[PDB]
Amino acid sequence: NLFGEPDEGIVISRFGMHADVESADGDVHRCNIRRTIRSLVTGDRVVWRPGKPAAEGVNVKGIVEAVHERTSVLTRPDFYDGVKPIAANIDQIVIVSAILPELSL
RNA sequence: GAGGGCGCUUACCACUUUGUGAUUCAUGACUGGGGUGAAGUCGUAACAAGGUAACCGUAGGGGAACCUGCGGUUGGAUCA
Numbered sequence: 033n034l035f036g037e038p039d040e041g042i043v044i045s046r047f048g049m050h051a052d053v054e055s056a057d058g059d060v061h062r063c064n065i066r067r068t069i070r071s072l073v074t075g076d077r078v079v080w081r082p083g084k085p086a087a088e089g090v091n092v093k094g095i096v097e098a099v100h101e102r103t104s105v106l107t108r109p110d111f112y113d114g115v116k117p118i119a120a121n122i123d124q125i126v127i128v129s130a131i132l133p134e135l136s137l
Numbered sequence: 138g139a140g141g142g143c144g145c146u147u148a149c150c151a152c153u154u155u156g157u158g159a160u161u162c163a164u165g166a167c168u169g170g171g172g173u174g175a176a177g178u179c180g181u182a183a184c185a186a187g188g189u190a191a192c193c194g195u196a197g198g199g200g201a202a203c204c205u206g207c208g209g210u211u212g213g214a215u216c217a
């Protein structure tokens with residue numbers, strides 16, 4: 033409760049119980065998520081509010097309220113896990129491989 | 138004179154000092170695991186004969202669930 037300013041920002045990472053949300057200027061600010069969120073991935077623009085600092089200048093978390101529409105999505109299914117999206121909202125993929133341990137085709 | 142007092146000295150001994158142990162609390166870089174986490178990643182181990190029957194003890198292996206070797210049990214199916 034007692035949330036802050038609704039704004040657009042880019043999610044840095046995903047940690048299940050919470051997520052790292054970068055603001056519109058480059059501020060690392062971790063936030064938890066809304067219970068109605070079906071999925072949240074790395075690099076997804078969201079609607080979020082950075083809570084309210086209890087101590088003056090020292091805040092713990094904010095919340096991520098809403099999720100914008102997807103440009104792309106990387107959904108890969110799995111046995112006994114179902115279809116799970118990994119990443120989204122991307123234009124280019126770079127397949128990176130090495131000769132060690134193996135280089136398969 | 139007898140005797141007493143003072144003073145001195147000795148015995149006992151508190152506090153106090155050094156050397157060096159035992160024990161206890163607080164602090165403590167670092168470090169060992171474990172628990173609590175529905176949505177995160179990695180795999181599909183076990184529960185059906187769960188797709189190499191499982192489990193226990195022990196040794197070795199490797200991100201990991203685990204696997205292999207030896208021995209035992211049925212808390213195993215199908216089987217005469």
Ligand SMILES: [Mg+2]
Nearest residue numbers: 181182183187
């Ligand atoms: Mg299995």
Ligand SMILES: [Mg+2]
Nearest residue numbers: 183187190191
């Ligand atoms: Mg099995």
Ligand SMILES: [Mg+2]
Nearest residue numbers: 192208209210
């Ligand atoms: Mg056996």
